[PDB]
Automatic annotation (TrEMBL), chain A:
Disulfide bonds join 87-96, 89-93, 89-96, 93-96. This is DNA-directed RNA polymerase II subunit RPB3. InterPro entries: DNA-dir_RNA_pol_30-40kDasu_CS (IPR001514), DNA-dir_RNA_pol_insert (IPR011262), DNA-dir_RNA_pol_RpoA/D/Rpb3 (IPR011263), RBP11-like (IPR036603), RNAP_Rpo3/Rpb3/RPAC1 (IPR022842), RNApol_insert_sf (IPR036643), Rpo3/RPB3_RNA_Pol_subunit (IPR050518). Residues 189-212 are annotated as: Disordered. It is found in: Nucleus. Keywords: DNA-directed RNA polymerase, Metal-binding, Nucleus, Phosphoprotein, Transcription, Zinc. The keyword Secreted does not apply.
UniProtKB/TrEMBL annotation, chain B:
Keywords: DNA-directed RNA polymerase, Metal-binding, Transcription, Zinc. One of its GO terms (biological process) is DNA-templated transcription. DNA-dependent RNA polymerase catalyzes the transcription of DNA into RNA using the four ribonucleoside triphosphates as substrates. Common component of RNA polymerases I, II and III which synthesize ribosomal RNA precursors, mRNA precursors and many functional non-coding RNAs, and a small RNAs, such as 5S rRNA and tRNAs, respectively. PROSITE patterns: RNA_POL_N_8KD. One of its GO terms (cellular component) is RNA polymerase II, core complex. It comes from Sus scrofa (Pig). It comes from the Eukaryota. This is DNA-directed RNA polymerases I, II, and III subunit RPABC5. SUPFAM superfamilies: RNA polymerase subunit RPB10 (SSF46924).
From TrEMBL, chain D:
This is DNA-directed RNA polymerases I, II, and III subunit RPABC3. It comes from the Eukaryota. Keywords: DNA-directed RNA polymerase, Nucleus, Transcription. Belongs to the eukaryotic RPB8 RNA polymerase subunit family. The keyword Nucleus applies. It is found in: Nucleus. GO terms for cellular component: RNA polymerase I complex; RNA polymerase II, core complex; RNA polymerase III complex. The keyword RNA-binding does not apply. Its main location: nucleus. It comes from Sus scrofa (Pig).
Automatic annotation (TrEMBL), chain E:
Belongs to the archaeal Rpo11/eukaryotic RPB11/RPC19 RNA polymerase subunit family. HAMAP family: RNApol_arch_Rpo11. SUPFAM superfamilies: RBP11-like subunits of RNA polymerase. Residues 31-103 form the DNA-directed RNA polymerase RBP11-like dimerisation domain. The lineage of its organism: Eukaryota, Metazoa, Chordata, Craniata, Vertebrata. GO terms for biological process: transcription by RNA polymerase II. This is DNA-directed RNA polymerase II subunit RPB11-a. It comes from the Eukaryota. The keyword Transcription applies. It comes from Sus scrofa (Pig). It is found in: Nucleus. Keywords: DNA-directed RNA polymerase, Nucleus, Transcription. InterPro entries: RBP11, RBP11-like, RBP11-like_dimer, RNA_pol_Rpb11_13-16kDa_CS, Rpo11-like.
Amino acid sequence: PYANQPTVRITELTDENVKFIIENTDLAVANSIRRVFIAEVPIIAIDWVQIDANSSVLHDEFIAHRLGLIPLTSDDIVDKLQYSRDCTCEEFCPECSVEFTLDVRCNEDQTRHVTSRDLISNSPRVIPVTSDDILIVKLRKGQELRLRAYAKKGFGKEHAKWNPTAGVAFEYDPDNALRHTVYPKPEEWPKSEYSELDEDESQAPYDPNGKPERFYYNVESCGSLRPETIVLSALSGLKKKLSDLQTQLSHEIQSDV
Amino acid sequence: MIIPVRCFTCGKIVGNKWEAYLGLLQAEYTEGDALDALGLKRYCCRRMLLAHVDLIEKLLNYAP
Amino acid sequence: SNRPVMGIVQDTLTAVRKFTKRDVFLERGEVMNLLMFLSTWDGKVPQPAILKPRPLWTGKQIFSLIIPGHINCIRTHSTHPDDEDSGPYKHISPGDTKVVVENGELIMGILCKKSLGTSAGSLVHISYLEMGHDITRLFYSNIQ
Amino acid sequence: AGILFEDIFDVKDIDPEGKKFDRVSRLHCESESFKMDLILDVNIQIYPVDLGDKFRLVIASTLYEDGTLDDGEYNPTDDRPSRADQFEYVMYGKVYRIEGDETSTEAATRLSAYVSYGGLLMRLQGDANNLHGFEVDSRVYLLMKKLA
Amino acid sequence: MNAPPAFESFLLFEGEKKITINKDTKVPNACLFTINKEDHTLGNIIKSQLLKDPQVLFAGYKVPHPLEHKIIIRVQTTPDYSPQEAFTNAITDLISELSLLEERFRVAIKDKQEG
Amino acid sequence: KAFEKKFRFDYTNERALRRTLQEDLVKDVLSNAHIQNELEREFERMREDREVLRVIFPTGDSKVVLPCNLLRMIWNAQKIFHINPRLPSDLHPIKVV
Ligand SMILES: [Zn+2]
Ligand SMILES: [Zn+2]
């Protein structure tokens, strides 16, 4: 029984970012947490595009690539949805995917902007985050885009479109008391926003017994999940990976004996 | 050809900011001010819009 | 040219010079990570060079585990002053510019191209002449 | 006891040539009892040393102060009483050279013992009788305790 | 032409063991844990949690090849402690820390949202 | 002068022999002239080799390329057998010759 006893302080919480501090953790746990924010927090994104008509100046898989990157609301439906690989249905079904439609024709002289607002989902829980709107393609008069897409569950470790973060700022030891980074000329380096030093001194005095214990986070959200949901989803997902691992380890230990 | 949906570096959505960015420049904003107004703080995202070339406008001139 | 044709190169050569500096100290966790990448490791963690106030292993200590067998080599660092060999500190180098590998252990000296590159008398050359190609093969990969 | 050498040294110079390395300083110390000259590389970051500092230096072949050989492997879990508990700065090294004023016929009156503590070098000069416990290729422990 | 599927880094193909334990013959009380479809995420926390155990003599992990998706964790314990027992305790300590972290983050959100 | 001092075995100096050789070995070296004759022949052969070298390398460049590294082999032997340079040796000079 040598578990840490982390404490959490949330400094800033908006609709886009959550700023918080974790204290009394190992650097490995703090790094694995940010590393799960990016790669192992599931969301719903378009991963299956079928284009019926595309007269735009962008080729078919150019459009599909853009549709995959469009963030979709995933706050609570993502937990309910199953992985299409795990689901027992056919290619797709409502329990493992969300169907999308896009049918735009340009007939006016003015350029028609095909945006995420033109994506229509079969489930109100999963919609483009913008509903300015993300531009998919611009249509000239006489050009049309007619496609149907399926959005499925996934996480950033597979493709960056399932990464829910727009930048995870991670920091520790802002005053470099541990000297994990050695400045050739410390006076030349800007103070961290979390620096507690005075203007006169550039580095905190070296701490021989110090260890990384306090970690600063700024988890910005793409929009698919609330920033606080990304953190909670990461903490439960990381716990799930460990609990799943221990179940396998228990079998291996039992199997050997 | 068209504004990328996400910033290449961090994945922030930038494909809904090109028209707003152009409008701000129309409003006599400097490029730095317009990027700040759009919330693009990291220079990776500012790179996306500051260096974008909208060739799709030229392509729409050609009849389908 | 009766010398090795391949040696240590861009990153490993630049880093091994930094690694074998006198003032490189590794914590318990850092050392255990490095030994994971030592295929020839016997599994015994060496006694740290510094035991108190904190256990710290030097870079030379960890590199000594990489060195195969019990080869003995004498080289000089690229920045070795010419008059140091004639001075009162010939065998205790102020700059750590004298490379002595004795009984397979790097007891002093900063390793560089002169002691790890493709030159006759190189520590890599001794490994081949003493331990053979198979052990020298592992020596190359373990350094990297 | 398993102690090869013990004395009290006073730091005379910290880096006469200059600061060759950031985290390591070369102490030039002299003893007052045995009049042994000491050159020592110290991890100055974790164990700062100042000019004129007085410290007790012990060179021992074992830390257990019971005659039991350590065998030269890291054993943090060992609970056996250790001589290191009384000292602040403990280093483990290997003596790699023993020089002396010996001639073809006459023996050595002054002996120099060189020890490498994982690359940190120590030279211990003085009368030969004071360094008789030093044998090349032998593992020794350096134990330092600053005296107020 | 030779691009592996993206899912291959976290999905086990049929007949693949998630974790295998191999005794280390070099030294006593040492085992090698080969975990499939894992990366530095779990390798680092398990390694760092093991290093907190006073009965663990050696704890270390490695990704043998970035293009492969294996982590090898080497654990050496004291004679009275088993590497497998250290591994299980390390995960429980990690799970307890994560579960406690989840609870304290939820409280922080509620306090921040409330005012 | 340097060549003779460094390579000619000195079986006349009793004190020097005690430092380098063991007691049972110095007596044999000092007692019988058959061993001393062998040592004298050894230096004469070395002196002949010295003149041959001068012809082969008139420039005096002693750096050569040869199969076996004798100096490192000796260094290996010292470490393998834990030779103590301070103590007198038990290797009879004649066994070397
Ligand atoms: Zn389904
Ligand atoms: Zn960005």
